[PDB]
Amino acid sequence: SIDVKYIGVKSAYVSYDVQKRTIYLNITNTLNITNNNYYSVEVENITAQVQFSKTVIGKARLNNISIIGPLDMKQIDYTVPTVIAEEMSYMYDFCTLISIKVHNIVLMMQVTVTTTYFGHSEQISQERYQYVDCG
Amino acid sequence: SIDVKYIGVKSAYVSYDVQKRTIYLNITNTLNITNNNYYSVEVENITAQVQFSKTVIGKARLNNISIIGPLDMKQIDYTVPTVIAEEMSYMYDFCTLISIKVHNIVLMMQVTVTTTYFGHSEQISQERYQYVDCG
Amino acid sequence: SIDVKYIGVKSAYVSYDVQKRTIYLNITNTLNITNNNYYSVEVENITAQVQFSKTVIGKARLNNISIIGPLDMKQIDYTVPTVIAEEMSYMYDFCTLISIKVHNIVLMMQVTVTTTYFGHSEQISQERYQYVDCG
């Protein structure tokens, strides 16, 4: 990939920015830019390409065959009991969180039992992330 | 891919931004841009391509075959009981969350038992994320 | 892909923005742009392409064959009982949330048992996300 950028606040090619309570006077700004970009990217020039798959079963005997793909989840248990018991008392809860299997971004590509692949595959993530903020 | 950007506030090619309580006076700004972009991208030039799949079964005997694709989820349990008991008492709850299997983004591509693929595949996420804010 | 941007507040090619309580006086701004973009993108030049799939079954004997595609979910259980008991007491709940299996964006593409694919596939997500905000 090319030119993948995370900029936290400000982006410019050229900047003349003036901020706070400043005096900016008699300034002469002159700019002459030549900025040309040429991209020949992810380009393919092929005579022949073959993705051949063949399965042959002769006079064979097959019994109890199990093929299982990735991410198989079996008998998973989450037990998260919350119990509050109070008498003659005071409870103050602020920003209290119980979080079970919380997901932000899930990117899945080519998750398979069998795969034949030719070419390009790409995953990009750019993120500003805050889970909890309080005061 | 090309030119994939996260910018937190401000984006320019040229910027002259004048912000707060400033004096900006007698300024001469002159600008002369040539900025040309040329893209030959994700381009393909091919004489032949073949995606061939063949299954032959002859005088075979087949019993108890299971083929199971990815992300099989079986007999999963979430148990999250919440109990409050009070007498002569005070509860103050502010911003209290119970969160089970919460998703933001799920992107799934070519999730299969079998795949034959030629060419380009792409996933992009760009994000400002905040789960909790309180005050 | 090309030029995929997330900008938090403002985007411009050339910007002369003046913000707050500022004096901007006698300013001379001159601009001369040439900015041409040329795109040859996802272009294909092919003489022959073949997607062949063949299944041949002769005098075979087949019994108990199961093919199961991805994301199979079986006997999943969610138990989230909430119980509040109060006498001579006070409950103040503000911004209290119980969230089970909540989804924002779910994108699924080419999710199948078997697939033969030629070309381009793409998923893009751009987002400002707040789950909870309160005060």
Author numbering:
A (entry chain A), B (entry chain B), C (entry chain C): 120 to 254
Paper text:
TMEM106B is a type II transmembrane protein of 274 residues that localizes to late endosomes and lysosomes. Here we used structure determination by cryogenic electron microscopy to show that residues 120–254 of the lysosomal type II transmembrane protein 106B (TMEM106B) also form amyloid filaments in human brains. The TMEM106B folds shared a similar five-layered ordered core comprising residues S120–G254 and contained 17 β-strands, each ranging between 3 and 15 residues. We observed three TMEM106B folds, with no clear relationships between folds and diseases.
Our best maps for filaments with folds I, II and III had resolutions of 2.6, 3.4 and 2.8 Å, and came from case 1 (sporadic Alzheimer’s disease), case 19 (MSA) and case 17 (MSA), respectively. For all three folds, we determined the structures of filaments that were made of a single protofilament. In fold I, this region packs loosely against the other side of the C-terminal hairpin-like region with the formation of three large amphipathic cavities. Likewise, there is an extra density in front of the side chain of Y209 in fold I, but not in the other folds. Individuals with fold I were homozygous for T185 or S185, or heterozygous, indicating that fold I can accommodate a threonine or a serine at position 185. Owing to the compatibility of both residues with the glycosylation motif at N183, no differences in the associated glycan densities were observed. Filaments with fold I were more common than filaments with folds II or III. We divide the sequence that forms the ordered cores of the folds into three regions according to their degree of structural conservation: the amino-terminal region (S120–T166) is conserved in all three folds; the C-terminal region (Y211–G254) is conserved only in folds I and II; and the middle region (A167–M210) varies between folds.
